[PDB]
Structure formats: C-alpha cells, structure tokens
Amino acid sequence: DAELLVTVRGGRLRGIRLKTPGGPVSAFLGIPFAEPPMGPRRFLPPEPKQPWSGVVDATTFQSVCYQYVDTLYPGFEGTEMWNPNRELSEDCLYLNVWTPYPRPTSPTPVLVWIYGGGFYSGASSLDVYDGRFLVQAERTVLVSMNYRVGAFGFLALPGSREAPGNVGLLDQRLALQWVQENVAAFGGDPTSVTLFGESAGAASVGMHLLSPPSRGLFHRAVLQSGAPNGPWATVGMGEARRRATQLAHLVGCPNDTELVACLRTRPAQVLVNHEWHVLPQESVFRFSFVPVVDGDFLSDTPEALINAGDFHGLQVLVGVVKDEGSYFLVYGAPGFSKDNESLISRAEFLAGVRVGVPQVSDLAAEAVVLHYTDWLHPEDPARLREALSDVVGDHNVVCPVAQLAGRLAAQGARVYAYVFEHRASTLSWPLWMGVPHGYEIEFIFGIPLDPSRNYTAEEKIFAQRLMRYWANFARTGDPNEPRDPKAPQWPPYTAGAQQYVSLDLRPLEVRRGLRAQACAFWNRFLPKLLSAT
Amino acid sequence: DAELLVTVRGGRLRGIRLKTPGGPVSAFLGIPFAEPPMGPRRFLPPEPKQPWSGVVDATTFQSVCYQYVDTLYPGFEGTEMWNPNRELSEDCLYLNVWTPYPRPTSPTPVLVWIYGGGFYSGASSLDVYDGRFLVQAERTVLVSMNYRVGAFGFLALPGSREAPGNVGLLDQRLALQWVQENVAAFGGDPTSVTLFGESAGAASVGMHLLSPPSRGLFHRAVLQSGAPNGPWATVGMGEARRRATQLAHLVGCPPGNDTELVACLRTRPAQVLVNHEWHVLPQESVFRFSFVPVVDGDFLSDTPEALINAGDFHGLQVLVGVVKDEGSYFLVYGAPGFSKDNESLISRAEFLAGVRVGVPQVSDLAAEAVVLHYTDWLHPEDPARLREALSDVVGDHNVVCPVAQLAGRLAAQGARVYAYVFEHRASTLSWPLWMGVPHGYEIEFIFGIPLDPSRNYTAEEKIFAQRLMRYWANFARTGDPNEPRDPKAPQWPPYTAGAQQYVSLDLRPLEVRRGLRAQACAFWNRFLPKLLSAT
Numbered sequence A: 001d002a003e004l005l006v007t008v009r010g011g012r013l014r015g016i017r018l019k020t021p022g023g024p025v026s027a028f029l030g031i032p033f034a035e036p037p038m039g040p041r042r043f044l045p046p047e048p049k050q051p052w053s054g055v056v057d058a059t060t061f062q063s064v065c066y067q068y069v070d071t072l073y074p075g076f077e078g079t080e081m082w083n084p085n086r087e088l089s090e091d092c093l094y095l096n097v098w099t100p101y102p103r104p105t106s107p108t109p110v111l112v113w114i115y116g117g118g119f120y121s122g123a124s125s126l127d128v129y130d131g132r133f134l135v136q137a138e139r140t141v142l143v144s145m146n147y148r149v150g151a152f153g154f155l156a157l158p159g160s161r162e163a164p165g166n167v168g169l170l171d172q173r174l175a176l177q178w179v180q181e182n183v184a185a186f187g188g189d190p191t192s193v194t195l196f197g198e199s200a201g202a203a204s205v206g207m208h209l210l211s212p213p214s215r216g217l218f219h220r221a222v223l224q225s226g227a228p229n230g231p232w233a234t235v236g237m238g239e240a241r242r243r244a245t246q247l248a249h250l251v252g253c254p255n256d257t258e259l260v261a262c263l264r265t266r267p268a269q270v271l272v273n274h275e276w277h278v279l280p281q282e283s284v285f286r287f288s289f290v291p292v293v294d295g296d297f298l299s300d301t302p303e304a305l306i307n308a309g310d311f312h313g314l315q316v317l318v319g320v321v322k323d324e325g326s327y328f329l330v331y332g333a334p335g336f337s338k339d340n341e342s343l344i345s346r347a348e349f350l351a352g353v354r355v356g357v358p359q360v361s362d363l364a365a366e367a368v369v370l371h372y373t374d375w376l377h378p379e380d381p382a383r384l385r386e387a388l389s390d391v392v393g394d395h396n397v398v399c400p401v402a403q404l405a406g407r408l409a410a411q412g413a414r415v416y417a418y419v420f421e422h423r424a425s426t427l428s429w430p431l432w433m434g435v436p437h438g439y440e441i442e443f444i445f446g447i448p449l450d451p452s453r454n455y456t457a458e459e460k461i462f463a464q465r466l467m468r469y470w471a472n473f474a475r476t477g478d479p480n481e482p483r484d485p486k487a488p489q490w491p492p493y494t495a496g497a498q499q500y501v502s503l504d505l506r507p508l509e510v511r512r513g514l515r516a517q518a519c520a521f522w523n524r525f526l527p528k529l530l531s532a533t
Numbered sequence B: 001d002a003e004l005l006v007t008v009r010g011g012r013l014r015g016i017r018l019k020t021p022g023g024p025v026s027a028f029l030g031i032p033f034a035e036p037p038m039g040p041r042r043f044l045p046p047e048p049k050q051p052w053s054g055v056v057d058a059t060t061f062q063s064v065c066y067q068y069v070d071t072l073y074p075g076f077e078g079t080e081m082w083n084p085n086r087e088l089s090e091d092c093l094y095l096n097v098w099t100p101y102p103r104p105t106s107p108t109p110v111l112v113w114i115y116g117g118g119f120y121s122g123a124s125s126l127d128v129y130d131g132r133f134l135v136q137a138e139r140t141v142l143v144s145m146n147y148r149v150g151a152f153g154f155l156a157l158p159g160s161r162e163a164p165g166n167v168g169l170l171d172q173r174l175a176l177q178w179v180q181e182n183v184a185a186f187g188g189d190p191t192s193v194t195l196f197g198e199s200a201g202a203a204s205v206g207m208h209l210l211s212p213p214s215r216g217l218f219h220r221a222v223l224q225s226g227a228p229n230g231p232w233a234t235v236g237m238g239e240a241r242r243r244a245t246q247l248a249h250l251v252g253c254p255p256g257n258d259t260e261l262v263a264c265l266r267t268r269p270a271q272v273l274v275n276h277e278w279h280v281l282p283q284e285s286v287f288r289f290s291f292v293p294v295v296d297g298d299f300l301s302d303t304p305e306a307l308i309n310a311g312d313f314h315g316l317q318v319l320v321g322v323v324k325d326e327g328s329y330f331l332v333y334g335a336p337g338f339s340k341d342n343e344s345l346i347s348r349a350e351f352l353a354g355v356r357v358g359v360p361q362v363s364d365l366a367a368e369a370v371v372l373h374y375t376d377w378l379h380p381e382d383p384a385r386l387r388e389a390l391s392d393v394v395g396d397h398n399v400v401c402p403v404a405q406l407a408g409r410l411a412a413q414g415a416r417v418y419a420y421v422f423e424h425r426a427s428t429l430s431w432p433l434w435m436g437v438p439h440g441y442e443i444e445f446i447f448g449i450p451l452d453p454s455r456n457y458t459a460e461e462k463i464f465a466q467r468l469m470r471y472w473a474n475f476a477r478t479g480d481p482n483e484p485r486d487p488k489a490p491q492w493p494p495y496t497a498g499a500q501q502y503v504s505l506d507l508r509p510l511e512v513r514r515g516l517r518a519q520a521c522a523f524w525n526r527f528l529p530k531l532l533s534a535t
Ligand SMILES: CCN(CCC/C=C/n1c(=O)cc(C)n(CCCCCN(CC)Cc2ccccc2[N+](=O)[O-])c1=O)Cc1ccccc1[N+](=O)[O-]
Pocket: A070, A078, A079, A082, A116, A117, A118, A198, A199, A200, A273, A276, A277, A283, A284, A285, A286, A327, A328, A331, A332, A437, A438
C-alpha cells in the first residue's frame, strides 16, 4: 500500500508490513547510511551514503559485517542465536527503522539499539533484536544499525591517517546523524533519541556519552551489562599498535602507510582467521580490536572523562544480569564445559583466576584469591565454580557498571539501576550458568510475544512489563509509571544509598548495594595495589 | 591446724585456712622462690631463693612488682580491678599455693596460673585470681607467681651480660622449677602440671611451649585470649635495644657503652623508669607495649612464628580460646572518639585514623587493605558499624588471628587442641554495653568468683562458673574438657586445621561452631604479610 513507501534525504524506500499478535508494524530493513567501506576505504572512517536513484528494497536485512563465527558448540542454540544470519560482507553499513503501522501523526520518541559482541561480532539482523513487538506495544520508533567490528572497525595504528581506529564507533555516530536528519520521515522525534545497547553496545553507548561530537545526537542512554570503563572495552595506543602489527605479521604483510596498504590487499576472511591470535595471553573476556584511547573520540581514558565530567541534565538506565561471567568460562577456563557440572578443583580455580584476570601481578592474583575464597570451604568445587563465575562477572561487567553509575549519579545525572535475574524457560545453557550474559534482551525486545516461541504466558506479561519500563524511560527519563503510584517504586540509584531493582517474575523489589563489597576491591583497592607493585 | 604447716626444700611455711561456701582450702601465700632482684641484680636473671632459718609467714600476699598504674578513670571498678592491690616493690618474686583442706592422699594434677597485662602490669595477688573456689570445687593444686614486668623484667640490651632480656620469663621458669621440686609437699603431682594464663600470660604459656628448657616443667597448656605469635608479644633485638637506649636517654643516662648505660639505669629510682615507659614506643599505638620478650636467640631461638611451624608438639593437649569482643576496650586508650562513658560513635575520618593507630608500623597500602576488608561499603559512614569495625580490627589483628594461627599449626603437628569462644557478658560488668564481652572478663568465671557470697552474681552465673571450672579441671586431669563417660552432653570436639571446630561458652549449652573468624584471619595470617614484604 502507501504506508510502505517513504522518502528520506537520499532517495525513496519501500518497506514491509510485519505482523504482531497485537497488530501490524511498518519496517524498513537495510537502509544504506554509508558508502560501502571497501578497498581503499577499509580501516577508514565512513563516508555518508550519496543519494540514489529509484527506490531501495528495504524489505529485508542487509549483510552482516565480517566477523569471527562461534563454532565451539555446533548447532547449539545458546551460541547460534548470536552468529550471523545473513552473508558476511564489508558492504554492511546499513540501518533499520521500525514504526507503528498507522504512522504516528505526532512526533513520537525514538529508541536506537547498538548491538554487542565484544566489538568483534554482532548484527542488527539477529532475531532477539527484532523490534516489531517493542514498537507495536509502546508506539515508539526503533532504529538499529550495523557497525564494523573486529579489525575492520577497530584496528588502529595511532597517529597515521590510514588506520586511525574507532571507525566502528564512527559508524554508529554516522547512523545517529542519519536519525537526526531522517527519523522524522517515519514519525520519529529527533528531540527524544534514547540510546540503548548491551555488552559492547552498552560500552559504545558510554563512549558517545563521553564524546562531545556525539553528545548532541541523543538525549538519554541505557547501558545493559556493559560500560566503557571496563578492562576489555578500551586499549592503549601502544598495545593497539602492537596488536595491529602482530596481525600484519601473521598475515604476511609487514612504515605505517606501507603496513595498512598491504592489509587492504588481503581478503576479509583471511584477517578474521587470525583475530584471536593477536591477544597478549590466554584469557577470557578479552577481545583483540576494541576502541583505542587516542585523543580523538576520547580526549582521555573513559575513567578520566567519567570523573571530571558534568552530567547534569542526563537520565541513565543501567543494569546487569544475575550471572554475568558464567558462560565465558567454557571458552578457555580449565575444567569448564557447558555439558557437565564444571565442578572444578582448587588448582583449576587458581589457574582460572589468571585467565579471567590477565596481565596482572602474582600478588594481585593473591588478592583476588583471598577475596573470592571461602576459607572454611577452600576446596568445595561448587563454591569454587561460582567464585570464578563471580571473578569474571564482577571484574568485567558488574563493577565497571557500578563505578559508572555512582560517578554519573553523584555528578549531575539521574540514574536508574536494575538486576535482571529471571532465567528464561527456553534457556539452552546448563542450569549452573544461571542467568548468563545477554539473556535479558529477549524480554526487553518482547520476543516472548512471538507465538512461534513457547515462552510461558507469565513470561509474556514479564516482557510487556519490561517493554513499558524501557519505553517509559525513553519518553520521560523515568522508568516508573507516573500513572500508578501504588505499584512498587523504582528509586534512582545514588552513590550513597545504591538502590536498584530486581527484574523477575515477582513485582519490583528494591535492593541496596550493587555487589558493593566486591566492587570496592576492583574499583578502589586493586588499582592502588598495581600502582605500588 | 596441722594442714597449715609444711616444710618446703628451702625451709618451713605457715599457711592460712581459707573459707569457701562449699568448704575450706589450705593456702600458702608469699613463698619466696627467688632472691630479691634489687640494686645490682636489677635487669638480671633471677637466682634461686637461699634457704631460710625458722618459719616463713606464708599467710598473706607479698608485694606487687613495680608497674604502671591505670590512673585514667580514678575509682572505676573495671579499671581499678587490675591495678596493684599491694605495696609496689622490686622485691616481688614470690608465689602462692592453694590445696584442698583434706590434703590429697593421691598425687593430684597442678594448675599453674600466669597473669597477663601486656608484660607491663599484673600480679598474682589480684582478687580475680583467687584460687579458693577452683581448688575447693575441683580438688586440684593451684599455683600462681609474680614475675617482673615492664623494663624491670624485659629491658633488653641484646648481647650484654647486664641486660640480657626475658628475665621476666626466667622468673616464670624458676617458679615452674620450684613447682617441680616442691608441689609434691602439697599433694601436687609434678608429672601433671597444666599451665593456664590470659593476655600476656597466655603469650607466656605459648613461649614456654617454644622454649625447650621450659618443656620439661609442664605437660598441658591453656592459652586464653593470647598467643606468642601476636604482633605485640615479641620484639626484635634491634628494636629492643632502640627502645632501651631511649629509656636511658629519657632518664638522663648518657649513652663499654652498654655496661655504662645499664649501670646508670640501676641508679635511677624505680618509679622514674615507670614514668617514662610508654615514651619509648615508636609511634601512637593501641594494644602495643614497650618492654616485651625479645627474640634474642636464647629463650626464643627464633621468632615465635618460626618456632611454631616446625616444633615438637605431638602428644600435647592445648586449650585455647578468645572472648567475643577482644579489642573493644583497648580503643579508649588512644583511638579518636572513644570513651567508656561516651557511646563512641566515631566519624569515618576518625575510623581511618584509628586504623593506623591500631595497626601501626605498616605501609599506607597495608592500611588501605585493612580499611577495604573492615569497611561496610554499603554503610561506610554509619558510626555504629565503624565503632564495632575498629574493635574487630584490633581484636582480630592482636588476639583472634594469632590464636587461630597457633591452634592450626599445633593441630597439624600432632597436638590435641580444644578451642572455645567465651560470649557471656557478666551482669556485674562495669564497662559500657557496646564493649560486649571485653578482653579479660572470662577470668572471673574460670576462677569461680561467682561463688563469692559478697558478690552479686546471678544464680545461673553460679552454675556457669561451676561448669567452666569443670572444663578446666577435666583438662588439667585428662587433657579433655568434656566429661569422660557422658552420654547426654553436647560433646566438645577437638580443633583441627580443616574442620576448625570450636564451642561457645555462655549460659546456653555447648554450641559447636566452625571457623574462628576464618575469612578475616586469612587476611591477617596469609595475605597481609605478602603485601608487607612486597612494598
Ligand atoms: C583452541 C584453538 N583455537 C582457540 C579459539 C576458539 C575460542 C575463541 N574465544 C576465546 O578464546 C575467548 C573468548 C572470551 N571468546 C569470546 C566468547 C564469549 C561468548 C560469545 N557469545 C555467544 C554466547 C557472544 C556474545 C553475545 C552477546 C553479547 C556479548 C557476546 N560476547 O561478549 O562475546 C572466544 O570466542 C585457536 C585456533 C587455532 C588455529 C586456527 C584457528 C584458531 N581459532 O582461533 O579458532
């Protein structure tokens, strides 16, 4: 019909009508927002997509940016749900727009979703990122982009104009500029753009908070299980150049301009096959090509920008899942597998500490062991497994988020914190993993409402609940319903009270302290210990 | 009576019949076991008391060794109860013997009590150490002694024949030799001597464990709220000389040099040395004392920590325990914002400064680690938690963790170890309520002081003390506190390095618990030394 044809600043589009149990949604999938970054444009910042003739087939997702594919458990849904579902291509800078079927007459707020994957993987075309239910239920405009991952998005030879780094973040920013100029044609309100992302997508959201050229592109932010001040999310110029030159050596390509020009001659798959080989040691929850602290996108380290920053006028929604680092362990930690109880020995535990906490002195590992050992049950395998699951989760996700939330709130921002702790009825991972990293996204996106999936009807109510929390934050900067002050109130997170909410099948429950005892070790004591040994 | 006259190897003695609600006891108070360590014999090891003509008036307590007196809270019971209740004199090397009035026909085990007080105070003539009710109710011989304290017993110029150090411990050893020679004359069995002491007395007991010449003088040991491996109980030869030369300087003794320096100290009157005792301490401290046993290579061949890891401990019954609030009352002697009359709700800025006075001579990084473990980062400002937290800091760092460390190594090397936690607050307690069960207030119940009619203890505090005296006496006889053939009684299990089992001591029956502040002592005993030798 006529609702599926819209015209943006670059040309004409033809969308597709998507069906929801509660009605239809208008979807425009695979809108080009950048000229294909190929050949000489590899490793380079993106160029805005020049105008085109005719109409663009916007009825299906475009290609996935080149990335490593998980093959640890072949055919296992717990891993396959994150693998690409389209063909790999460097011609992948495309975005998507969902909008309610009766296109909103009044400007409706906009959610922009930035995906995770340790800056090495991810695609907006994944099924758990389907935004038809989130739009049909709450009547907002949802936008999701693809950004270059791996060396294609974050390889950096700092200083050189040919490999400047952070171009995957610049892909996101260009997509945000596109929203400022074109979301109005879909009913979106360019004055109510709320960024929300998970894992590296959440860390990416934190980057745009600390980057002035991005700050005028969105108004509020949601950081799900990720923060830019995490140990995995940023790398120094010295190590970034070390990892890039190590890749050029492994691929046969060893000044700076000579190095990059050779790398552009290698097929994209050839670089992907040597990605994990540039890491400085055997580790878990570490990724090769991540944003670099270079002085452009980030004037300083994310930690420094966070402390000295003024965040008045900012509303932030942050949170974690119950068991963040559980499934990371099966990717290199001794004695761990998704297929047994992973009841590890203490020798395996002490060895696993060095894998979860790499590039760290022997004394600091002793400090980690002292805090996470039950010295009445130092050998109990079950306690030891949960301990290492806490070591990885707290060090990489929880304590980075708690450090950011306290700093933002105590420096002008209005922060709301959560802990998603509902294990899905469909979860294919083992039971000892609990609620693993990334398994709140299905409910945030209202995937339970899909009839073809056998979520419990009580889980569908849970999904619609969470969808309202997010939409309420997007509209007002407050997740609470101003309609119903009888329902349990979600209080703001503060540096002192440290109040947060538990999200599960039960009604809201206010808890205090976001692992406050453990995160005092990671954020306060451990830096002093490394700075003195 | 005939029971009040006995002949010891040095001469004759005239004793006293003492009265208890349950019966009488013979007691011989003020027996001279050493020649008076006065004048030129100051700072020197003791010499055996020369035999005497006629009888000795063993009917009243002898003097108290020269020591500091706690003038901090004049007339306060909790303070005055430990202050000396006899004339101060350097002529103080005397001991006392309690024995049942029907003098035992069979050889009976002997309990030897060593008082505490940071090696600077204490006396066997205190009311809390009265041996009537323990000897009457359980029919064991009890012996206590006076040993030199302060600089008189522990001033050390390492390497000099004039101030060789540890002479206060040599006083104790001489008393134990006297018990070996003479306790048989009172019904005591020289082959069943059990040492029990508290605070620095318990530390002394553990040092007799680690000193071979003392090892043939007893068979069992009880350490109450003290350990030889504490940070306060020993001192290095270099620091020992540094503290002693400064004392000579502060009394106008111009600093062979060592022979001159001691001879000048021998001239200054006794009270002058006491007045300048706490001034040789290196910095602001709490639970830290000036003149303590020195690791000189004689009495202590090595550091007590070293002697404990590789010792001769198999076939040794040891009783060990602490009170619930070991460090509470120390804080009022230097921690900012603390007083017995106040409620001591300190600010965090006072907590941080009080940490560095309870844990002195540590790096700033070490103090940061203490703050990390003992802060409640969900309520880091609450003055009520900060008050209890600094109590735990001083309590763990000085008593609990050194004691748990001792119990573990003894058990792993073949010692039958029994551990307790005394968690009953006395109704008579003069200290504020927030101090809980403070350091030293299990002694009254172990000695059966609740049985004194002139005291206003509960009727249940009376059956409590009779149960503790039973535990201690059963240990002295058998090396096992619980009753021999007792079906219905919560059995007291031995302490082990793995299970770490101990019992709670209060009006409620024996509750068996595991872990003697294990999470906290892992920091003090394991990680903190690594961090201290890596900065
Ligand atoms: C054993 C021999 N092999 C080893 C490589 C295989 C393992 C790669 N490996 C790691 O070592 C470490 C880590 C941390 N990880 C990331 C895993 C995280 C979970 C992924 N998760 C989906 C559940 C995705 C996700 C979804 C949502 C949010 C966030 C995330 N997220 O955070 O990822 C790894 O994959 C070497 C080799 C030798 C010759 C040729 C080729 C290779 N070679 O290299 O294959």
